[PDB]
Amino acid sequence: MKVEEILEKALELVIPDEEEVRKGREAEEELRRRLDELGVEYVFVGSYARNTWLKGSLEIDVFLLFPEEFSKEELRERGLEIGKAVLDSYEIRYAEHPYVHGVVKGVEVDVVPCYKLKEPKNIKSAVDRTPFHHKWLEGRIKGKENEVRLLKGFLKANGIYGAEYKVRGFSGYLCELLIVFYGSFLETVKNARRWTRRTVIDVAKGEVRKGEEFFVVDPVDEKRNVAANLSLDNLARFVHLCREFMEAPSLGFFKPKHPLEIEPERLRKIVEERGTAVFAVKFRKPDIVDDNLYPQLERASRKIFEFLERENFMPLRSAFKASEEFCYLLFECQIKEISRVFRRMGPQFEDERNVKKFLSRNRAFRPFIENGRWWAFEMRKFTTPEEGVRSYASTHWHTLGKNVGESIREYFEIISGEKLFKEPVTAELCEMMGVKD
């Protein structure tokens, strides 16, 4: 319905509602009140400050600004003190150096202590450059706030907003840098059609060039890749969505797909048509934060995938899910049953001592020579992919992530069939198998 009219309608799905904007301003004024009474110098940074936050993601970022001559724990101990006095409730979170996360009048706030540096040139981590992030964007982004919200809404409706590990998508700072570089949502989307996995966007030089990896150069620190947490596959999904949108634009690109919600009977039918083995490893969810859990689920699922490939079960795809109580690692394989017998490699015929050792073992069938080398028929200890994973998980839990592995050691189950379709995984199965509406 013409690109320009679709973008006007999308603004209603992307701009926060009335009670959100008011809820936020009440919390900000109260927060100013408490900090001012303590005599601390501070600055509100982030998407709240710059009026670029997406509908439904209200969150207030504050940095406490201190004299340049204070030690490492003079900023840690003192900075925390103020953060605990100013919030209704709090939690010691850990991004790189510890900060405070809490609530003020029912609104999430982060309080981060750092130096008051005149000019940046002083490297440490991402914490100490964040004030300079705000300083660089403030007033380069003025007038373009809705362009930022269009880009964030687009990305969110398609599951790729956020740099946290559950997502591996686009951060808020990244969205704002893109809008500054290209000028608008529409120009971002038109130009991203030509991005590659080697594209380097150098915001401070107004330059695009080729490199070894996808790299967005932080204008505050030339060694920092702002797109570091963006996965290759999510970059690919975004380039394809940009091409599709420009080919046939729709308001539907700004709305989240309502899920498949299939009945166990239709899934049973689909699994019968495909002729595959479909199963899950179930275990208790360890008590750790998402940014620690999700890298472990990814690793555990890859190590089991690699086992299935090496054992000739021909895995197609894998997925994983965490609920409140349990985690699930999901697999589909092309092979449901393999023969008991397999071929084990022995030595070359010339090597007399090692040939004697190879032929000494008792076996049911006779070894043989093929292309100058000895081989023997031997028996597998499992013949289905479910039996294989039971064995792998019981013995090699120590490679499946520190905490995920320790949980599997205590308890796991392999589930298939009518039992599997009753766990909260039908949505992940459907996506993994490419099931249509």
- Interface residues for a second copy in 116-145 (CB under 8 A)? none
The owner of tokens 């249509």 is 436
Q: Which is nearer to a second copy, 94 or 368 (CB)?
A: 368
Which entry of a second copy, Na ion, ligand UTP, none binds 391, CB below 5 to 8 A by partner kind?
A: Na ion
Q: Which stretch binds Na ion (CB under 5 A): 65-73, 86-94, 262-270, 384-392?
A: 384-392
In 3-state terms, what secondary structure has residue 245?
A: helix
Q: Smallest distance, Å, CB 300 to Mn ion?
A: 13
Q: Is 47 one of the annotated binding-site residues?
A: yes
User: Which residue of 72, 210, 366, 381 would you call a contact of a second copy, by CB under 8 A?
Assistant: 366
- Helix segments in 322-379, DSSP class H: 352-360
Q: Is 76 one of the annotated binding-site residues?
A: no
Which entry of ligand UTP, a second copy, Na ion, none binds 349, CB below 5 to 8 A by partner kind?
A: a second copy
In 3-state terms, what secondary structure has residue 63?
A: strand
Q: Is 336 in the site for a second copy (CB under 8 A)?
A: yes
Report the DSSP pairing between strands 199-202 and 215-218. Answer: parallel
Q: Is 381 in the site for Na ion (CB under 5 A)?
A: no
Instruction: Report the alpha-carbon distance of residue 65 to residue 60 in Å, rounded.
Output: 16
Q: Is 61 one of the annotated binding-site residues?
A: yes
Going by C-alpha positions, the residue among 310, 319, 247, 306 that lies closest to residue 278 is: 319
Q: Is 59 one of the annotated binding-site residues?
A: yes
Contact characters 203-242, a second copy, x per CB under 8 A = -----------------------------xx--xx-xx--
Burial of residue 1 (number of CB atoms within 10 Å: 0-12, 13-18, 19+): exposed
Task: Show the CA angle centred on residue 54, arms to residues 48 and 58, nearest 5°.
Answer: 50
User: In the structure encoding, which two tokens stand for residue 232, read together?
Assistant: 């290759």
Q: Is 371 in the site for Na ion (CB under 5 A)?
A: no
Amino acid at 324: E
Q: How many residues does the chain have?
A: 437
What does the binding site for a second copy look like in residue numbers (CB under 8 A)? 193, 196-197, 232-233, 236-237, 239-240, 243, 273-277, 312, 314, 316-317, 333-343, 349-350, 352, 355, 364-372, 377, 383, 433-436
